[PDB]
């Protein structure tokens, strides 16, 4: 949330997202031999409920940025201003 409010840190944001992807694939590799009542699943749901707030925030972030690929270029925004490269006055974007 902090690195996205301003520019000149897109590299830091990209490196942070890469580290997060590596962390999530690491903690996902812990469940490749899972059982329906294994201890690793209990430990993982425990560490999830102990940090429900932060994971809820990142889920809201991912949902907000995934509900944008389709909400723009499906109905109206793709034909609002058809000039060429994406040009928007930032006021029609708000209402769109």
3-state SS of 33-85 is CCCCCCHHHHHHHHHHHCCHHHHHHHHHHHHHHHCCHHHHCCCCHHHHCCCCC
Of 58, 65, 57, 52, the closest CA to residue 19 belongs to 58
SS3 for 24?
helix
Of 58, 50, 57, 49, the closest CA to residue 23 belongs to 58
Pair 26, 39: CB distance under 8 Å: no
Q: How was this structure determined?
A: cryo-EM
Of 42, 78, 49, 66, the closest CA to residue 96 belongs to 78
Q: Which helix (H) or strand (E) holds 14?
A: helix 10-28
What whole-number distance in Å separates Cα of residue 37 and Cα of residue 24? Answer: 21
Resolution in A: 3.5
Question: What tokens does 19 get?
Answer: 């580290």
């Amino acid at each position: 949330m902090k690195l996205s409010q301003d520019s000149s840190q897109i590299e830091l944001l990209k490196e942070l997202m890469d580290l997060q992807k590596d962390m999530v694939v690491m903690l996902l590799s812990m469940l490749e031999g899972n059982v329906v009542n294994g201890t690793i699943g209990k430990q993982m749901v425990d560490m999830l409920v102990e940090s429900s707030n932060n994971v809820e925030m990142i889920l809201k972030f991912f949902d907000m940025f995934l509900k944008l690929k389709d909400l723009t270029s499906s109905d109206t925004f793709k034909e609002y201003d058809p000039d060429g490269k994406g040009v928007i006055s930032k006021r029609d974007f708000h209402k769109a």
